[PDB]
């Protein structure tokens, strides 16, 4: 008895919390898709129907890649006169929106309003993270880990500290693009300087929207850096070192976290 | 042959012993062969053989008393329990479930089926308290185990029995269902505190069935309609997609086939 497959209508939120947006609300073939601040109204140009045939449609026309090589733009196009393969997309649990024919992924290579969307080689960067939802705000939460301690930001540094609900520095904004941002400075991002084990994670500008700034909360309690395969890890299970690192998955308590809101 | 048994004692309980207990419960509720949007699905009730329908949870406490809860693997929920030579069962929902529970505790001397099911509404009515005014934690569970035990000897009256079910169901069934609620019970043990569940916990419990449906019927994780949840302070927010739920939900009731 097979599960129903519905066609939800949702916004698509991505880099820096901006929305997938048919530019100027115009729907002639070839008009560019862009990042734009998420609206609260019913305008069609930000409301996407996730059709059963793996198309993504606004005002009845298709989100369409201009081509199958990295860096080309993404546009609105008549679903039946567009090349069919160019209108097909899969939406992955880890936040990637991929075009199967090309294996390239939807991307915003700049973070400004008006940035034209492109397809790019998948590197699981923040510039390639998306969420289908009508939530225009990030999910604000504390992040609790080893010994019940709270992830805490102090300027550029991050460590775990005794939890206090009074502490804004222990509040985290989980953005649609996969970035984890200190509540007090939403232009900053939980950042690993590399894809390599034992790199100490820091708080740095979200400007690069890089592979080292995208994170996924997994079902086993770990927080995974998608590109590297490494998880967030309280170094040597020792909070007094004030260092959180990337480390290969073992699932011991120093790798287990929980979003408590 | 007996159903699988998992053990927990409140005597000397630690964050680690409770975590190991809950993980072992999840490992016997489902194989993990059916995982949807990274969230394991419980076995489908339809055609599930009776010898695979239940698991047992033997609880012990500092007073050296034990009871054994029976859990339905299709929804992780308590269906009854055994204390000594007596078994006690929630009112079955249907004829097939009434036949099914006769396979539990088959050598027990006495068996009693209550007038009430195990839904919270009625248990709260019987207990005289809502979930938001019933403390959870290792202390409450220690007391619930004693209460469940002494019901068989005439030493526990119905409101205390109802409150004890509410405690056990949340600390065992809902914790198995939700990493979030397992974490909440972990915190109570960590700090040796008892406290009632905040609105985020209660609303998750209330929404488990609808969340399972929404995720399994989603188009690639996007819901057809939102699920409303609450923050710890009672404020409301809506969830439109499975992403934020992946670390929050650990098991779903089987709703349909992939």
């Amino acid at each position: 008895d097979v599960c129903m497959d519905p066609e939800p209508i949702v916004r698509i939120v991505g880099r820096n919390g901006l929305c997938v947006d048919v530019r100027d609300g115009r729907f002639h073939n070839g008009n560019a898709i862009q990042l734009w601040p998420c609206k609260s109204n019913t305008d069609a140009n930000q409301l996407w129907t996730l059709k059963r045939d793996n198309t993504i449609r606004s005002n009845g026309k298709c989100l369409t890649t201009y081509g199958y090589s990295p860096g080309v733009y993404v546009m609105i196009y008549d679903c039946n006169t567009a090349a069919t393969d160019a209108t097909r997309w899969q939406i992955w649990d880890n936040g990637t929106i991929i075009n199967p024919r090309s294996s390239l992924v939807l991307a915003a290579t700049s973070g400004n309003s008006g940035t034209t969307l492109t397809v790019q080689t998948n590197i699981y960067a923040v510039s390639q993270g998306w969420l289908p939802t009508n939530n225009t705000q990030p999910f604000v939460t504390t992040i609790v880990g080893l010994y019940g301690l709270c992830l805490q930001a102090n300027s550029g540094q991050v460590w775990i500290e005794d939890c206090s609900s009074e502490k804004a520095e222990q509040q985290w904004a989980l953005y649609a693009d996969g970035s984890i941002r200190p509540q007090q400075n939403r232009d900053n991002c939980l950042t690993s300087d590399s894809n390599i084990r034992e790199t100490v994670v820091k708080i740095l500008s979200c400007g690069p929207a890089s592979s080292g700034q995208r994170w996924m909360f997994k079902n086993d309690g770990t927080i995974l850096n998608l590109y590297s395969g490494l998880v967030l890890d309280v170094r040597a299970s020792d909070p007094s070192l004030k260092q959180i690192i990337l480390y290969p998955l073992h699932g011991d308590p120093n790798q287990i976290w929980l979003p408590l809101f | 042959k007996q159903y699988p048994i998992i053990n927990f004692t409140t005597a000397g309980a630690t964050v680690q012993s409770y975590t190991n207990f809950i993980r072992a419960v999840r490992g016997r509720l489902t194989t993990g062969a059916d995982v949807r949007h990274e969230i394991p699905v419980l076995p489908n009730r339809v055609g599930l053989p009776i010898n695979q329908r239940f698991i047992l949870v033997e609880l012990s406490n500092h007073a050296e008393l034990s009871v054994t809860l029976a859990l339905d693997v299709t929804n992780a929920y308590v269906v009854g329990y055994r204390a000594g030579n007596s078994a006690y069962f929630f009112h079955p929902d249907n004829q097939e479930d009434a036949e099914a529970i006769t396979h539990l505790f088959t050598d027990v001397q006495n068996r009693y089926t209550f007038a009430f099911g195990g839904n919270y509404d009625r248990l709260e009515q019987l207990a005289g308290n809502l979930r938001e005014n019933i403390e959870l934690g290792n202390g409450p569970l220690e007391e619930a185990i004693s209460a469940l035990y002494y019901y068989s000897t005439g030493g526990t009256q119905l409101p205390t029995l109802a409150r004890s079910f509410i405690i056990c169901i949340q600390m065992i069934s809902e914790a198995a269902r939700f990493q979030y609620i397992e974490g909440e019970m972990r915190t109570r043990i960590r700090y040796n505190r008892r406290s009632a569940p905040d609105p985020s916990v209660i609303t998750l419990e209330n929404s488990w069935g609808r969340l399972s449906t929404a995720i399994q019927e989603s188009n690639q994780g996007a819901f057809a309609s939102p699920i409303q949840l609450q923050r710890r302070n009672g404020s409301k927010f809506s969830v439109y997609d499975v992403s934020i739920l992946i670390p929050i939900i650990a098991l779903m009731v089987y709703r349909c086939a992939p």
Partner: nanobody
Amino acid sequence: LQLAESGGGLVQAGGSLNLSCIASRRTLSTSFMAWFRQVPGKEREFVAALRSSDGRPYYGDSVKGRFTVSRDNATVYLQMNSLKPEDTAIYYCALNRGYSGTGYPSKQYEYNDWGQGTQVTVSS
């Protein structure tokens, strides 16, 4: 209920020792185990504690990453490394019960069960 310390002795500066604290009995109501030290004429000084519920360690100010307090299946240990002459003292293990909350007991008057102490002497 009796606590017994072991493992004290003589070492020279920069050396290491490992103390152990064994209870006569296992009670299941303990909240914290702790190590203290005392020299003549001074109050007893908090050295280290271990939260029973989850194993979280805590250390006094003068043990500057040098010691490790830990627990085994079935005994609490204090691994002391890079020992300075200022660490010479009688070391005591202590037990606290019924603690509730997010902090930790760290003063002598918050622990009611005490071993007799073992002498630690650091040379040079």
